[PDB]
Ligand binder design. Sequence first.
Ligand SMILES: OC[C@H]1O[C@H](O)[C@@H](O)[C@@H](O)[C@@H]1O
Ligand SMILES: OC[C@H]1O[C@H](O)[C@@H](O)[C@@H](O)[C@@H]1O
Ligand SMILES: [Ca+2]
Ligand SMILES: [Ca+2]
Ligand SMILES: [Mn+2]
Ligand SMILES: [Mn+2]
Lengths: 180, 180, 49, 47
Amino acid sequence: TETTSFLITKFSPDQQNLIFQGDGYTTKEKLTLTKAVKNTVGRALYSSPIHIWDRETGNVANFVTSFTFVINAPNSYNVADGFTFFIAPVDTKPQTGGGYLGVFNSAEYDKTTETVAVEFDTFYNAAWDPSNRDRHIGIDVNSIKSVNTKSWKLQNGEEANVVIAFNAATNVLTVSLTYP
Amino acid sequence: TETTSFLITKFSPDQQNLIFQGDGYTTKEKLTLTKAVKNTVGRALYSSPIHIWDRETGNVANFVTSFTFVINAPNSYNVADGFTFFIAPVDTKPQTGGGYLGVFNSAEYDKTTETVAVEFDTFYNAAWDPSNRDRHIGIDVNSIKSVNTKSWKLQNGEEANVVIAFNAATNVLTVSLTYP
Amino acid sequence: VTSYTLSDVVSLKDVVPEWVRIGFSATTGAEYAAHEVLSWSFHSELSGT
Amino acid sequence: VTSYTLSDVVSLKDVVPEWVRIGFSATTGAEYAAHEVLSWSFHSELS
Ligand SMILES: OC[C@H]1O[C@H](O)[C@@H](O)[C@@H](O)[C@@H]1O
Ligand SMILES: OC[C@H]1O[C@H](O)[C@@H](O)[C@@H](O)[C@@H]1O
Ligand SMILES: [Ca+2]
Ligand SMILES: [Ca+2]
Ligand SMILES: [Mn+2]
Ligand SMILES: [Mn+2]
């Protein structure tokens, strides 16, 4: 049995158990992935590799993660591109920016990426996003075209509290977001 | 508020959340630090940095760790040098071997080293080890000459269950070793 | 208290490796916003059956 | 069942850095033995 756990309730200026990429940085109290600037990428990873499945027993991990995030757009109706929690190989580096959320490269399924992501997408990208043009939550598997999505109404400057969980027995990944 | 935790009940050949130094390596079932050979060192570290105390608050963490270990000497009369659990800087690399257990470099207090270690010392080193010449448990702060020791009768080939706990309110470090 | 929920079947074993890193990413392009995290917690566990 | 206990005050805040790595080490010199750990768990919490 292997267990990995952690809790960060408030971020410190030196936050050594995270790995920063792109413009990712912490301050007193929060982790800023991107500032409100055009054409930028911020990523932040947890330091330690996580054992998520074992080829020898065939077992898969049950996991649960939860976080509070804020999106702050200065033009409230012109918002892009989004935020994702992702799971990727240990050596993961920033992928394509903009509508690719720093985690993918393609709107086609790519076995080489080995990345599952849960997106909170704020910008409609005609080439792959829901035709209904709504901002959305989505489950991405080796592609920026999500396998499933849900429309979500953004609350600018408001704290979303998210819980994501994965059940090893059924293989269902559950996502919930809540605003107060 | 910050928590770090992990549990590994059996070590794997690909234990990627650990950092090996020296001859430390994991096999099927065991984490091997030294084979039974002359003048050797082995260290293994958890990959993620731990926030043990804080500047702005002056807050200090409470922690507890538990482990099973086995010492195996081919000659039960010529047993050296020993084993430690340590807390050192993030960039920690091996120090002097043999009698210094790979974590200290002298018997005089050295603030530089910034390491607290709990030793399980099997070899009497005349210069700093207890006058009774016994194998012992000890608490080491920036010196291989322990601040406190307790005689321990090595049971060769046997499994020792250790629990080390640190209470932040009292600043008391407690070590307990149990054989079956 | 406005709550949203999405759920699907992801067979992790066939997509990601045994050992992974998890994290967050956020991007901007021609349009932008600041993206920020306030808290995070994770717990996982794997059997040795 | 045979047990040993030790306790002492250690002022961790004046000895180690705020961020640390934890781990095991073991050495041999002119004499020797195999040193192995079979399991390991840890938990810490700062407020
Ligand atoms: O920021 C919105 C938008 O800007 C550009 O049109 C591109 O970089 C897209 O990928 C991105 O989605
Ligand atoms: O191995 C026992 C002993 O061997 C030598 O005398 C040195 O390497 C010592 O430091 C060590 O303690
Ligand atoms: Ca999009
Ligand atoms: Ca000694
Ligand atoms: Mn989308
Ligand atoms: Mn000693």
